[PDB]
């Protein structure tokens, strides 16, 4: 059952997304980012993202409206 | 009894039959419940005024009928009639049906009684009305059969239209239950075969009652064949219960039928397998039923199978109430709410009559579950258990009493949740606090009509006007001393302990 | 009257068979999917779209 | 010509719908239809289909009916709503070849010079695969028998599209699957292998009965092939091949030993974390 | 008025090249077809017609079509060849009549016979009887040489429409002027 | 394990909510008010939460 | 009615903007039905590219209520 | 080979048929003997719904079977 | 491995059992979303 | 009055065709027509669906040939599909699911022509392997509803199992119409097929992998183990030296060697086991 | 005269008309009968479209002919 | 030997077979006795569903064993 619901949350990785830059993570499941529109944000991240690949200044993609790491 | 009466008849004997067939006991119970009547109408007045016109309207005129069960106290519906007239369509049917529960067992001259609240009060049709009338005449005689049967049978034949047949087959399949009268089985099967989607549900259920527990080589084929090859759904949702009643305690005998139904592709037959393995093993506590009846809950792929599979456990264990919380208490934390609802009902139904503490301990935190219908389930279950208790007889009662009130008063809450609370108000005060639920006779024999009562009741999920089927389960709690002439002596008794433990809940009708 | 303009922009790279990165001329970058018939062989990095 | 053919699920569901519907027009035991598709680099792709009226008088060959100018009309009506696809071949749902279908093929070939036959048996009675592919050829003979016009086999498979497998998976709520990893290997590639191989050898077994005067030896060809089979099968596992086998088994298992050792050490480490954490916090909270 | 489906089963055997009728039997029949189908459609506009031909195999040329021209331009370039085969033709026309577009139509077969028929009589009697219970009506023109086939056909039609059915005919003709001119318009409206 | 599946199921709804800005405080005012300036805009004088 | 329906559209709060380019357009090589666009293929005249004051740049597939002859960059 | 038909009105109709007949034919016989249009008739035999294109012996209907007619009402 | 995972992995204790979430939170959120809806 | 419980049964084939057609008009609201029958007052069943010739402009579409429709429909009957029209469907990419503006108008005339019509809307671009987004609607009455009448009757829990989304509330679903629950009812034969749909031939199962190349893979992973063991020693040494969560929070860049060490097991295992087993079997079954 | 027009739904309508009537009058009668607006509905006869500008005689519409009605299908 | 097979209605059949007998002969003789078409049926013993190619001895079936017949009652 866990495998069945595991990928069910990639409705969020839909096609139209904004590109932003990664800054730093407060605590796991939350971080701060700077969008290409120029304004910074403090936002939630999604769980299934592997944490061993986000490093200082790596281009990530954010939800268009909610502004959440995806 | 129907057998032994023949060996007895072939004088005092001519009146002894009046005890053997129950004629006395019924009217003694009636006289007790009418005299000892005691209710505070203020609660109804409140919930009435809190009604903002909605589904919730119906829940009053069902619930009211619970608290006046057996007692002929019409005087709540006799007045405030204009608000009652606001009902319409199918709901009107249910309102008329409640006129049964208030008169339950008021056997004699019933015919003129309902003809004072006629099926043709204006000869209107409104055939929700008249079908109601038949459903009431079925409920008065709920297990007495007798001279009414040959009336209702005729009255089914000449039904104009397909709602009258619905009430008719329900009433007839109610009164004549257990008898296996072959003419009745013929008439019901021919109406089932007519294959109309509303009547075939009523008839498909009733068909199961008149064969109750008498396993029958032929009829099970004549109905599983039909169920296995028809396209309307309601017909299947009727038959899925209609099958199981052909087994009753038959222990190992039914197992062949079981292995058929549980293999089926069709989800509703796969379900009805579970009801069968519940009714086949009541009270036995046999591990061999549990080991599979629970395995279905953990893996099957369609939710109503999971709910019915979990909820059935409430019947296997009811002879040892201590056990159920030891197994369900974990399962109540499942992710998908259907299982949680089933757990609430299993728990409520295992230990229905007692004040058992751990059951309530687990039921309390469910009342805030986000998903409204499990709140409805927990409220009903909470109210079935804890029947008749006082704050001395168990603590943790008077907070529920007000919980129900506040949730019914809340202006911004789901109707489907606040249906449960308004049903619970009536459950907790049934009959005028003089009646109780039990699956268990005084001598220790399992009691049949209440078992059927609750199994049918739990289907109110699918079809509302079915809820009155709980009124089978209110056995009265009283004692009577009787003279040799069967006169009533004016004797007294005493009781050993501080009166506050027994008392009626001290009505607090401020105005 | 029943017609609408369309935004101009520039392509940076093709990511997968259906994911392209574009930069609008005005500002924010984006991730956007193609239309089926457009001969994806032709969207070299740098073409206006 | 063709090297392989690929079928999309939409065709299979279409076939089944047709098979169930016919009961409203006849009583026949077979149905026939047209395959729309496309292809490139000798890989053929079938995508869509429609069914045309057909009928046959069962008790004889050579008496059958097939409606041309309904086929042509539908092909016209389809072309108007998808230009990508063109007549490619035909399908029928019988469990076995029939005498006259070569004479069907010589008709419908007038619509496409390369036409291919797909048998889609709708009621499997075994573990297996639902499709077979055939193409028509001419055979010479060494016996001086005249030139024969006869079918030839082509390998086949199911394919997929991202816009459909979303639907397939939304619908595959029926039973268990995906017993992950080592669980799925042995089932999928030992048991369901051996069952197939056994069924094949039973089929050969049955055929070699009929040659007990029940039927004429169909050719020395088939016997030559059988003799190749029993000649080729691997040499008796009795020579220095054995030495070469032991070497690899040792090497195959040694690394397993290593990995198992790693596997245990981590459990001990996790054990210690659980132990200390417990007792400490206990005494602390006391 | 009554709606009818009609299949015309022309004959094209080798024997059709001989010259009893003036141009050659092929032109002796094409005009007859041309008039009979005009009569079928002009009788009522939604009747409809199809075409079959008898050789060493039977062959369908155009299924039930409401426009006559489709048949005419089709009937041309049919070539005299091979040997007739009667039963198989009638069977395949029975099949093709089942699949008519509108089942409220009742149905007919027309056939032109122009050669010896090598059939066993007792096969015709079976075919006729089952066609009898299937409500298909047959109607034979002994267009070509009357002899040889004179008997078998007559007994066939008897066994079919007999028992006082009366809906099915045999009609026959010597060599002479045009079939359509002298013959076909004479017996009844057609057939 | 059941708890973990519950959380994962709800994450899709939960992370649909919008985020929050980050700014630099320049100096605090009295009666619980503060003057903070955001990254691309004007200084905002604004209150504080209860905790 | 047609001229009034045009008139009632023209509410005067227009934006203002500058033409950047005029383009010659040719349909695609291939076509479809059930799903074809009036604007990708099936255009053959002139098209324009405009720069708005608020620094947008829009392509226009249909010029609108002015004859393309009289425009220039 | 006798067959009983029951309509919604309960009138009983008697049919002399053959095991290899077809539903189209019996529906037509009813049309002749009562006047109901064929295509409005739907046939019911226990649960199964009978299909026009095939024959009684395929459903192994036996002598004096009782068989129901249902009317698919139409919108208006 | 079996003995180790089998034995002293008992520290999952009832000293602290299982938790839950808030109860007014969802109410507030639903009220706010219904306010948004009305608009 | 309409019962709350009434279902829509869609027949698995129709769904696949709705998707493969919607995910092509990628940015445009392609549309089509849908065929079925009204079994009963508690049912509607859709059995098949087919496309049309149509053209649009991104902001709209409509169909251009009216004759094509009647001709196709009247053709289909000749092969056992006499069923008629019950509704229509159109795809919304990425928006969500609702009816808006024009879609109500073309809808409402159906209901004047045929009560009990149904409009379906599907979304092909949010959907993903686990689940497809479909909805089915019908219009609320043309008001006269100041009476406060409910649109429907209720005599079951059966219709209140689901939570309406915020988006449809924004566009007003319960204000102008109502949703109806979708249900699937597969028959025996298609579900027998649907499981075969992935089976793979016996020919493969008995086949061995090459022994060379296989050895190469073994040596690759074994030499990859080293670095992870070396790193693991330090990672064991240094823990509990700081506050607990500040382990993870400081380990977002560099990898943690436990997982990468562990998941190189389940590659030596599985692989070596299955290869040795398959060889060990087939050494007997052939001669 | 009487004329039968039938729709993709399977419902059928009968109209009374005189040969001098135009198509527009037909559509107006349909709207009166059912409430569909005159601009939405398309008509078909003998496999070709109807258009206004003509009398019903002009297409040689005979007694008791059958017309097909099909709706405008727009979405956006 | 004598084996028992149970049907859902409480019918029981006793049947004569041999240890080396295969499932196909069992289904054949049940057909010969009762007339059930060989395919419409499944045999269940020990909570498992049997495979048509094996023998009874392959499933350790013993004397006087009873197994359950599963039946698609009317076939269709």
Swiss-Prot record, chain C:
Q: How does it assemble?
A: Component of the 19S proteasome regulatory particle complex. The 26S proteasome consists of a 20S core particle (CP) and two 19S regulatory subunits (RP). The regulatory particle is made of a lid composed of 9 subunits, a base containing 6 ATPases including PSMC6 and few additional components. Interacts with PAAF1.
Protein name stated in the entry? 26S proteasome regulatory subunit 10B
Q: Where in the cell is it found?
A: Cytoplasm; Nucleus
From what organism does this protein derive? Homo sapiens
Q: Which residues carry this modification: N6-acetyllysine?
A: 23
Q: What does this protein do?
A: Component of the 26S proteasome, a multiprotein complex involved in the ATP-dependent degradation of ubiquitinated proteins. This complex plays a key role in the maintenance of protein homeostasis by removing misfolded or damaged proteins, which could impair cellular functions, and by removing proteins whose functions are no longer required. Therefore, the proteasome participates in numerous cellular processes, including cell cycle progression, apoptosis, or DNA damage repair.
Which part of the full protein is shown?
Answer: 50 to 98 of 389
Family designation: Belongs to the AAA ATPase family.
What domain of life is recorded for the organism? Eukaryota
UniProtKB/Swiss-Prot annotation, chain E:
Top-level division of the source organism's lineage:
Eukaryota
Q: Where are the transmembrane segments?
A: none
Q: Please tell me one Gene Ontology term that the record gives under cellular component.
A: nucleus
Cysteine pairs bridged by disulfides in the record = none
Query: Is the DNA damage keyword given for this protein?
Result: no
GO terms (molecular function) for this protein are:
identical protein binding; molecular adaptor activity; polyubiquitin modification-dependent protein binding; RNA binding
**Biological process GO annotation list?**
proteasome-mediated ubiquitin-dependent protein catabolic process
Could you list this entry's UniProt keywords, alphabetically sorted: Isopeptide bond, Phosphoprotein, Proteasome, Repeat, Ubl conjugation
Q: Indicate the segments forming the VWFA domain, all copies.
A: 5-188
Q: Where is this cross-link: Glycyl lysine isopeptide (Lys-Gly) (interchain with G-Cter in SUMO2)?
A: 122
**Is Ubl conjugation among the key words of this record?**
yes
Can you state the subunit structure given in the record? Component of the 19S proteasome regulatory particle complex. The 26S proteasome consists of a 20S core particle (CP) and two 19S regulatory subunits (RP). The regulatory particle is made of a lid composed of 9 subunits, a base containing 6 ATPases and few additional components including PSMD4. Interacts with NUB1. Interacts with SQSTM1. Interacts with UBQLN4. Interacts with UBE3A. Interacts with UBQLN1 (via ubiquitin-like domain). Interacts with DDI2.
Q: What does this gene product do?
A: Component of the 26S proteasome, a multiprotein complex involved in the ATP-dependent degradation of ubiquitinated proteins. This complex plays a key role in the maintenance of protein homeostasis by removing misfolded or damaged proteins, which could impair cellular functions, and by removing proteins whose functions are no longer required. Therefore, the proteasome participates in numerous cellular processes, including cell cycle progression, apoptosis, or DNA damage repair.
Q: Which gene encodes it?
A: PSMD4
UniProtKB/Swiss-Prot annotation, chain F:
Function, please?
Component of the 26S proteasome, a multiprotein complex involved in the ATP-dependent degradation of ubiquitinated proteins. This complex plays a key role in the maintenance of protein homeostasis by removing misfolded or damaged proteins, which could impair cellular functions, and by removing proteins whose functions are no longer required. Therefore, the proteasome participates in numerous cellular processes, including cell cycle progression, apoptosis, or DNA damage repair.
Entire protein: shown range: 52 to 102 of 406
Name of the protein described by the UniProt record: 26S proteasome regulatory subunit 8
Q: What is the effect of changing residue 9 to Q?
A: In a colorectal cancer sample; somatic mutation
Write out the similarity annotation: Belongs to the AAA ATPase family.
Give the UniProt subcellular location, in the record's own words.
Answer: Cytoplasm; Nucleus
Instruction: State the source organism's domain of life.
Output: Eukaryota
Question: How does the annotation summarize its subunit structure?
Answer: Component of the 19S proteasome regulatory particle complex. The 26S proteasome consists of a 20S core particle (CP) and two 19S regulatory subunits (RP). The regulatory particle is made of a lid composed of 9 subunits, a base containing 6 ATPases including PSMC5 and few additional components. Component of a complex with USP49 and RUVBL1. Interacts with PRPF19. Interacts with TRIM5. Interacts with NDC80. Interacts with PAAF1. Interacts, in vitro, with the thyroid hormone receptor (in a thyroid hormone T3-dependent manner) and with retinoid X receptor (RXR). Interacts with ERCC6.
Q: Which gene encodes it?
A: PSMC5
Swiss-Prot record, chains H, K, L:
Locations listed in the record: Cytoplasm; Nucleus; Mitochondrion outer membrane
So where does this one cross the membrane?
none
Q: Which residues form the Ubiquitin-like domain?
A: 1-76
Can you summarize the PTM annotation of this record? Phosphorylated ubiquitin specifically binds and activates parkin (PRKN), triggering mitophagy. Phosphorylation does not affect E1-mediated E2 charging of ubiquitin but affects discharging of E2 enzymes to form polyubiquitin chains. It also affects deubiquitination by deubiquitinase enzymes such as USP30. Mono-ADP-ribosylated at the C-terminus by PARP9, a component of the PPAR9-DTX3L complex. ADP-ribosylation requires processing by E1 and E2 enzymes and prevents ubiquitin conjugation to substrates such as histones.
Q: According to the UniProt record, which cysteines are disulfide-bonded?
A: none
Membrane topology (UniProt): Peripheral membrane protein
Its function? Exists either covalently attached to another protein, or free (unanchored). When covalently bound, it is conjugated to target proteins via an isopeptide bond either as a monomer (monoubiquitin), a polymer linked via different Lys residues of the ubiquitin (polyubiquitin chains) or a linear polymer linked via the initiator Met of the ubiquitin (linear polyubiquitin chains).
Q: What is this protein called?
A: Ubiquitin
Provide the species name. Answer: Homo sapiens
The gene designation is: UBB
**Covered residues, full protein:** 77 to 152 of 229
């Amino acid at each position: 059952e866990f495998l069945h619901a595991q990928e069910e949350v990639k409705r969020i990785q839909s096609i139209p997304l904004v590109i932003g830059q990664f800054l730093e993570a407060v605590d796991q499941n939350t971080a701060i980012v700077g969008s290409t529109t120029g304004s910074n944000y403090y936002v939630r991240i999604l769980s299934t993202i592997d944490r061993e690949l986000l490093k200082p200044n790596a281009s990530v993609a954010l939800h268009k409206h909610s502004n959440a790491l995806v | 009894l129907s057998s032994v009466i023949q060996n007895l008849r072939t004088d005092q004997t001519l009146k002894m039959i009046k005890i053997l067939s129950g004629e006395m006991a019924i009217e003694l119970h009636l006289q007790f419940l009418i005299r000892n009547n005691n209710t505070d109408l203020m609660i109804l007045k409140n919930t009435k005024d809190a009604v903002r016109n909605s589904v919730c309207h119906t829940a009053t005129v069902i619930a009211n009928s619970f608290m006046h069960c057996g007692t002929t106290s019409d005087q709540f519906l006799r007045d405030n009639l204009e608000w009652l007239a606001r009902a319409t369509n199918w709901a009107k049917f249910t309102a008329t049906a409640s006129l049964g529960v208030i008169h339950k067992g008021h056997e004699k001259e019933a015919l003129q009684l309902m003809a004072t609240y006629l099926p043709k009060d204006t000869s209107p049709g409104s055939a929700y009305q008249e079908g109601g009338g038949l459903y009431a005449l079925g409920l008065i005689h709920a297990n007495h059969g007798g001279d009414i049967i040959d009336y209702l049978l005729n009255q089914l034949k000449n039904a104009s239209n397909d709602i009258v047949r619905h009430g008719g087959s329900l009433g007839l399949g109610l009164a004549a239950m257990g008898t296996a009268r072959q003419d009745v089985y013929d008439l019901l099967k021919t109406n089932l075969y007519q294959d109309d989607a509303v009547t075939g549900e009523a008839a498909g259920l009733a068909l199961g009652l008149v064969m109750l527990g008498s396993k029958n080589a032929q009829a099970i084929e004549d109905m599983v064949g039909y169920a296995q090859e028809t396209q309307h759904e309601k017909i299947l949702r009727g038959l899925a219960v209609g099958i199981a009643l052909v087994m009753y305690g038959r222990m190992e005998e039914a197992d062949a039928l079981i292995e058929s139904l549980c293999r089926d592709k069709d989800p509703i037959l796969r379900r009805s397998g579970m009801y069968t393995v519940a009714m086949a093993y009541c009270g036995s506590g046999n591990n061999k039923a549990i080991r599979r009846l629970l395995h279905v809950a953990v893996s099957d792929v369609n939710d109503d199978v999971r709910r019915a599979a979990v909820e059935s456990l409430g019947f296997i264990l009811f002879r040892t109430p201590e056990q159920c919380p030891s197994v369900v208490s974990l399962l109540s934390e499942s992710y998908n709410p259907h299982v949680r609802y089933g757990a609430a009902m299993a728990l409520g139904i295992c230990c229905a009559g007692t004040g058992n503490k751990e059951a309530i301990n687990l039921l309390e935190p469910m009342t805030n579950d986000p998903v409204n219908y499990v709140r409805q389930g927990a409220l009903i279950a909470s109210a079935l258990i804890m029947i008749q208790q006082t704050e001395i007889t168990c603590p943790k009662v008077n907070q529920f009493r007000q919980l129900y009130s506040k949730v019914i008063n809340d202006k911004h809450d789901d109707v489907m949740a606040k249906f449960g609370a308004i049903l619970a108000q009536g459950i907790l005060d049934a009959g005028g606090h003089n009646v109780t639920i039990s699956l268990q006779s005084r001598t220790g024999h399992t009691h049949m009509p209440s078992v059927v009562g609750v199994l049918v009741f739990t289907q109110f999920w699918f079809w509302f006007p079915l809820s009155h089927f709980l009124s089978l389960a209110y056995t009265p709690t009283c004692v009577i001393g009787l003279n040799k002439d069967l006169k009533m002596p004016k004797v007294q008794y005493k009781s050993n302990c501080k009166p506050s433990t027994f008392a009626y809940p001290a009505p607090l009708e401020v105005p | 009257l029943q017609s609408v303009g369309q935004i101009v922009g520039e392509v940076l790279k093709q990511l997968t068979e259906e994911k392209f990165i574009v930069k609008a001329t005005n500002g924010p970058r984006y991730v956007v999917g193609c239309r089926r018939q457009l001969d994806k062989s032709k969207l070299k990095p740098g073409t206006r779209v | 010509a063709v090297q392989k053919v690929v079928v999309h699920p939409l065709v299979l569901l279409s076939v089944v719908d047709h098979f169930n519907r016919i009961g409203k027009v006849g009583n026949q035991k077979r149905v026939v239809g047209v395959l729309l598709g496309s292809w490139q680099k000798k890989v053929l792709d079938v995508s869509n289909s429609f069914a045309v009226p057909f009928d046959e008088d069962d008790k004889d060959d050579s008496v059958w009916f097939l409606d041309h100018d309904y086929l042509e009309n539908m092909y016209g009506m389809f072309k108007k709503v998808n230009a990508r696809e063109r007549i490619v071949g035909w399908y029928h749902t019988g469990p076995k070849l029939h005498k006259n279908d070569i004479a069907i093929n010589e008709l419908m070939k007038r619509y496409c010079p390369n036409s291919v036959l797909v048998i889609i048996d709708v009621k499997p009675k075994d573990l297996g695969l639902p499709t077979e592919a055939y193409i028509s050829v001419e055979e010479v003979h060494d016996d001086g028998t005249p030139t024969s016009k006869t079918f030839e086999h082509v390998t086949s498979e199911i394919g997929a599209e991202e816009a459909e497998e979303v639907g397939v998976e939304h619908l595959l709520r029926d039973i268990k699957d995906t017993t992950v990893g080592t669980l799925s290997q042995r089932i999928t590639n030992q048991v369901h292998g051996l069952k197939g191989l056994n069924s094949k050898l039973l089929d050969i077994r049955s055929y070699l009965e009929k040659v007990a005067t029940g039927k004429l030896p169909i050719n020395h060809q088939i016997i030559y092939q059988l003799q190749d089979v029993f000649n080729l099968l691997p040499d008796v596992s009795l020579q220095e091949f054995v030495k070469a086998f032991y070497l690899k088994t040792n090497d195959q298992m040694v690394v397993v030993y290593l990995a198992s050792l790693i596997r245990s050490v981590v459990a001990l480490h996790n054990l210690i974390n659980n132990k200390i954490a417990n007792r400490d916090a206990e005494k602390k909270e006391g | 008025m009554v709606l009818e489906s009609t299949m015309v089963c022309v004959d094209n055997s080798e024997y059709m090249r001989n010259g009893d009728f003036l141009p050659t039997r092929l032109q002796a029949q094409q005009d007859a077809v041309n008039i009979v189908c005009h009569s079928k459609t002009r009788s009522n506009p939604e009747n409809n017609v199809g075409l079959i031909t008898l050789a060493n195999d039977c062959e369908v040329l155009t299924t039930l079509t409401p426009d006559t021209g489709r048949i005419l331009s089709k009937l041309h370039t049919v070539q005299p060849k091979g040997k007739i085969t009667f039963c198989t033709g009638i069977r395949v026309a029975h099949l093709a009549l089942k699949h008519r577009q509108g089942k409220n139509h009742k149905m007919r077969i027309i056939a032109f016979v122009g050669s010896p028929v090598e059939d066993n009589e007792k096969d015709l009697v079976k075919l006729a009887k089952r066609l009898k219970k299937e409500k298909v009506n047959v109607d034979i023109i002994n267009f070509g040489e009357e002899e040889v086939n004179t008997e078998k056909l007559t007994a066939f039609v008897n066994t079919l429409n007999g028992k006082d059915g009366t809906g099915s005919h045999l009609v026959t003709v010597p060599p002479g002027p045009s079939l359509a001119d002298a013959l076909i318009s004479s017996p009844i409206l057609a057939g | 394990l059941n708890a973990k599946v519950r959380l994962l199921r709800e994450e899709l709804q939960l992370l649909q909510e919008q985020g929050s800005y980050v700014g630099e405080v320049v100096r605090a005012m009295d009666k619980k008010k503060v003057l903070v300036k955001v990254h691309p805009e004007g200084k905002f004088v604004v209150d504080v939460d209860k905790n | 009615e047609n001229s009034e329906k045009i008139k009632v559209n023209k509410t005067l709060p227009y934006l203002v903007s500058n033409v950047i380019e005029l383009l010659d357009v040719d349909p695609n090589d291939q076509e479809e039905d059930g799903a074809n666009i009036d604007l990708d293929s099936q255009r053959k005249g002139k098209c324009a590219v405009i720069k708005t004051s608020t620094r947008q740049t829009y392509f226009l597939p249909v010029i609108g209520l002015v004859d393309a002859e009289k425009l220039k960059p | 080979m006798q067959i009983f038909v029951k309509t919604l009105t309960g009138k009983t109709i008697t049919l002399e048929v053959e095991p290899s007949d077809t539903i189209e034919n019996v529906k037509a016989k009813i049309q002749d003997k009562e006047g109901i249009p064929p295509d409005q008739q739907r046939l019911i035999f226990a649960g199964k719904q009978l299909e026009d294109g095939r024959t009684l012996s395929d459903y192994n209907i036996q002598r004096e079977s009782t068989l129901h007619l249902v009317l698919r009402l139409r919108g208006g | 491995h079996n003995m180790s995972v089998k034995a002293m992995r008992f520290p999952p204790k009832s000293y602290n059992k299982d938790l839950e979430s808030a109860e007014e939170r969802r109410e507030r959120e639903q009220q706010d979303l219904e306010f948004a809806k009305e608009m | 009055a309409v019962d709350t419980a009434e279902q829509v049964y869609i027949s698995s084939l129709a769904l696949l065709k709705m998707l493969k057609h919607g995910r092509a008009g990628v940015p445009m609201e392609v549309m089509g027509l849908m065929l079925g029958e009204f079994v009963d007052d508690y049912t509607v069943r859709v059995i098949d669906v087919f496309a049309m010739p149509q053209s649009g402009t991104g902001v709209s579409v409509e169909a251009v040939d009216p004759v094509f429709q009647a001709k196709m429909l009247d053709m289909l009957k000749q092969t056992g599909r006499p069923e008629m029209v019950v509704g229509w469907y159109h795809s919304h990419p990425g928006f969500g699911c609702w009816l808006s503006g024009v879609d109500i108008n073309t809808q409402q005339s159906f209901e004047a022509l045929s009560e009990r019509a149904v409009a379906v809307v599907v979304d092909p671009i949010q959907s993903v392997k686990g689940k497809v987004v479909i909805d089915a609607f019908r219009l609320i009455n043309a008001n006269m509803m100041v009476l406060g009448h409910e649109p429907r009757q209720t005599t079951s829990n059966l219709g209140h199992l689901n939570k309406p989304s915020i988006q449809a509330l924004i566009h007003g679903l319960n204000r102008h119409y109502y949703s109806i629950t979708i249900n699937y009812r597969k028959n025996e034969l298609e579900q027998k097929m649907l499981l075969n749909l992935h089976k793979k031939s016996w020919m493969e199962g008995l086949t061995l992998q090459d022994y060379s190349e296989h050895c190469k893979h073994n040596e690759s992973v074994v030499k990859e183990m080293l670095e992870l063991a070396k790193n693991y020693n330090k990672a064991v040494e240094e823990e509990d030296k700081m506050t607990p969560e500040q382990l993870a929070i400081k380990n977002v860049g560099k990898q943690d060697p436990k997982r990468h060490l562990e998941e190189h097991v389940d590659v030596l295992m599985t692989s070596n086991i299955v290869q040795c087993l398959a060889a060990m079997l087939d050494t007997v079954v052939f001669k």
